[PDB]
Design a protein around this ligand. Structure first.
Ligand SMILES: Nc1ncnc2c1ncn2[C@@H]1O[C@H](COP(=O)(O)OP(=O)(O)O)[C@@H](O)[C@H]1O
Ligand SMILES: O=C(O)C1=C[C@@H](O)[C@@H](O)[C@H](O)C1
Ligand SMILES: [Cl-]
Ligand SMILES: [Cl-]
Ligand SMILES: [Cl-]
Ligand SMILES: [Cl-]
Length: 166
């Protein structure tokens, strides 16, 4: 089982906190977005473009179940993995860290970024708020620990998690 599984919205810091947390614990980071691109040979945007979200979600659930069984380090899930009921069921029993972020800050963290299909293009603040309203209940449901990241720098987030683990 991973030492920690990180969930939350795009820009909440999964990739960032995951890397820093894994370094701290001296384990590997498995980022499921990365794992998907290495598996398929394709970019996430290109899977979404040609195959669509539903196919991305099926591939993502396969990857996630396997990593939950086989990975003993830190595991960072894609931001929308919790929208899959099978991912949510696979997460039961696991140490799941919900990185919380306000929409205003989340928007600003993701602002330069053009590699997220569900956020790209215009009207980003609206789209982000809509994602947060849909998913917040789902993150809260799978989480065993919640960490507010709005006013915390990444090293402080890591230390907060470290102190609450194990
Ligand atoms: N606690 C934080 N304080 C400041 N910036 C952060 C924090 N967490 C993440 N970031 C920044 O936000 C951006 C998105 O982080 P990322 O780790 O890729 O989020 P996710 O994987 O949840 O999409 C990155 O530039 C990262 O440096
Ligand atoms: O919010 C989402 O559904 C996504 C977030 C990213 O982590 C990637 O998994 C992908 O762009 C989908
Ligand atoms: Cl399984
Ligand atoms: Cl590991
Ligand atoms: Cl299950
Ligand atoms: Cl984007």
């Amino acid at each position: 089982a991973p030492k920690a599984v990180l969930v939350g919205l795009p820009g909440s810091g999964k990739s960032t906190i995951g890397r820093r947390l894994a370094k701290a614990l001296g384990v590997g980071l498995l980022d499921t977005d990365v794992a998907i691109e290495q598996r398929t040979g394709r970019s996430i945007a290109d899977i979404f473009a040609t195959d669509g979200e539903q196919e991305f979600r099926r591939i993502e659930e396969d990857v996630v179940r396997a990593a939950l069984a086989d990975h003993d380090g830190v595991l960072s899930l894609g931001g929308g993995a919790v929208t899959s009921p099978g991912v949510r069921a696979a997460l039961a029993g696991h140490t799941v860290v919900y990185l919380e972020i306000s929409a205003a800050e989340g928007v600003r963290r993701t602002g330069g970024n053009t590699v997220r299909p569900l956020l790209a293009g215009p009207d980003r603040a609206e789209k982000y708020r809509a994602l947060m309203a849909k998913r917040a209940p789902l993150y809260r449901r799978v989480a065993t620990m919640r960490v507010d990241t709005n006013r915390r720098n990444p090293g402080a987030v890591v230390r907060h998690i470290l102190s609450r683990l194990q």
